[PDB]
Amino acid sequence: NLRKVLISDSLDPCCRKILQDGGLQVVEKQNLSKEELIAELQDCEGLIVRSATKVTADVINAAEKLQVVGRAGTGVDNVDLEAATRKGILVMNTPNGNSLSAAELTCGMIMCLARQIPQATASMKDGKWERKKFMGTELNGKTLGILGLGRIGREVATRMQSFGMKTIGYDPIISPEVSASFGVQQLPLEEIWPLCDFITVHTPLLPSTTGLLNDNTFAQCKKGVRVVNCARGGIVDEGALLRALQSGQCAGAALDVFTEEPPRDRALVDHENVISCPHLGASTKEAQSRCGEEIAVQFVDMVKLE
Template sequence: MNGSTANGSAAAHQQAFHRAVAPSSPPVVVAGAGSFAGMMAASQGAAPAVPFSGSAGSPTASYAGAGSQRARSISIPGKPSSMPRLLTPFDQGDIRILLLENVSQGAVDMLRQQGYQVDFHAKAWSEDELCDKIGQYHAIGIRSKTKLTAKVFRRAEKLLLVGCFCIGTNQVDLTAAAKAGVAVFNSPFANSRSVAELVIGEMICLSRQLADRTNEMRAGEWNKVSKGCYEVRGKVLGIVGYGHIGSQLSVLAESMGMSVLYYDVVPLMPLGTARQVEKLEDLLAASDFVSLHVPELPETKNLIAAPQLAAMRKGAYLLNNARGTVVDLPALTDALDAGHLGGAAIDVFPREPAANGKDTFVDALNGFESRLRACKNVILTPHIGGSTEEAQTMIGIEVANAIIRYINFGGSTGAVNFPEVDLRVITQADSDDVVRFCHVHHNVPGSLKAVNEILGNHNVVKQNSDSRGDVAYLLVDVAGVDEEAKREIYERIGQTKANVLTRMLS
């Protein structure tokens, strides 16, 4: 299958690719790859994103202009011969990208500057809308409300990748995406500071009962009290999940005079004077505030339920800015009504409204909303932990960067469901007849042998391959091939038995 037909002018990023019609061996995601332990360990060494950074040895580049006639501008010093060469496809077809849920305008601008056709929509789309229109697009960018199901991926004939402009990817069927040869990227750490600062604000508001006093004042009631109101200085904060957010929160809390305990499923080096505890129950019993920062996994569902709430100090506060399934909210409501807890701050819920508006956060959603709203000293926010201008800008840059890198150069570093493979970019110094093949295939015996037999009589200058579960990905640069040879290699690789999707960039 080829990309969409050219519309008269040769657009520089139109991609040729072969996709298998019906993959016979469904890929699976490696067990443990998305585990709480794996995420927490990996998060400690993650580097911040920079706009459009290439693979090792590749300079940062950006492109300006529209359509097929675009001028390249390089954003760091370097010899012209070392700069990335703007790759063009074997067959022509405009790259079309669908962006939903009002993603960062900076990301929209970055993608349009690449010459892509970008369709931008402020709201999420339903499964039916996606199935009706997804076949037109090579990439889709979403946030948390758009659900990409196996049914959607079956209709996504041209789709190369998904960009999740958020932390989580549980709104995407990752196995179905991998089966279709679709890489999924996200931004797991870009909003860490925003969430950490929100938690600090929530702790102060809870300890001073600010939400209740504000509501009373809005109702015309003056209620100047000090009973039950405290400073956070000298109090103990217990952090569950000591990743990027948890560790940043730890530093901020200590700067305000708090003592910090943390619980994590793997041993992690503390920042400052924070101390790790071996058991969750030990943290709950010793903390004045408990803040949750764990991913949504089967082992974290109802991590804080009735027994854990009972183990907390009387008068303590619970804060959940992680995932809605981590806390048993009816049990939390019982603990608040009974006076065992002094208050709570909840930003995430098991089921959340699909759109903003009045009368959306009601009992028809989860069944506990009216009881929770009636509790004293409770802060309820509509999943805004990462909703700051700074966080959304950084997320936009990071995910747009991943989209550009994968479409333009084939690099899959940072993919959450896909082998992470990269090659040094083809530069101006390389010969003009170098071509790159991006081959997604089933991880079965003989798959690479079949490709290497096709390439055996050609000059392979760079090659990298990796697998993840049942899906594998190969990047290979071949030099010294004329147009006829390019076509032959491209067609033959796309016809191999293990092929899922093959693209060619030259």
């Protein structure tokens, strides 16, 4: 079954502990070269990654004993699913562990857009006292549009309801009855755009969600709409977002994620009305601990099957 598991990224110690409690041998090495990674995998049936380690077609094809790739996080962004499927390698992730940490960062970004706290801190640290520049907006009575009403979307909804925000949204798979149970009125996208003071995206990256916000959608928005992307780079068209920030059609944007990470185009990051993080949505001690446990349990469950 599984003898040895490699951990190629920085995880909570509890990942290794649960695996070793399950009778598995564990190696833990970070910042390994592509050649280095291939070398340490020759003894291993299991590999556990975060987002740093790139499990490409070349790494999969070279790792002969590899049976399972485990990602302590959501999606499979840094894993070639096609390459793994062709080799019969099982790819597992932790869809629940990061939900609350991503929802909390999203809520923080909404508050930061309303009051420009990051820009105000930068101003203060430059020895400036700029009261007029940083006149902000009250969230109470404003409309938040939530695109994607899965794990994270519903947690954002209930938190921002406590601020007196009206929460509307769209999800092609979630019933209006389910969304109603967490206070989100579902509408067609065309009805959402004109109502929103704030828009936040919580969808996978799919053809249908690539530029879910674009020039066509910004044209339908309230002048001065504020937008959050703590989901995946590209869901908000970065070209369309910059054009909306330049016109003032968009009053501000908060971006945890970019089409390229780190972004080589700095136009959005450098914009005075853009707040950003280097993909910190899952970067809490609690989320890293829960994902480490979630992936370790999946590995042990595989042992029980084998």
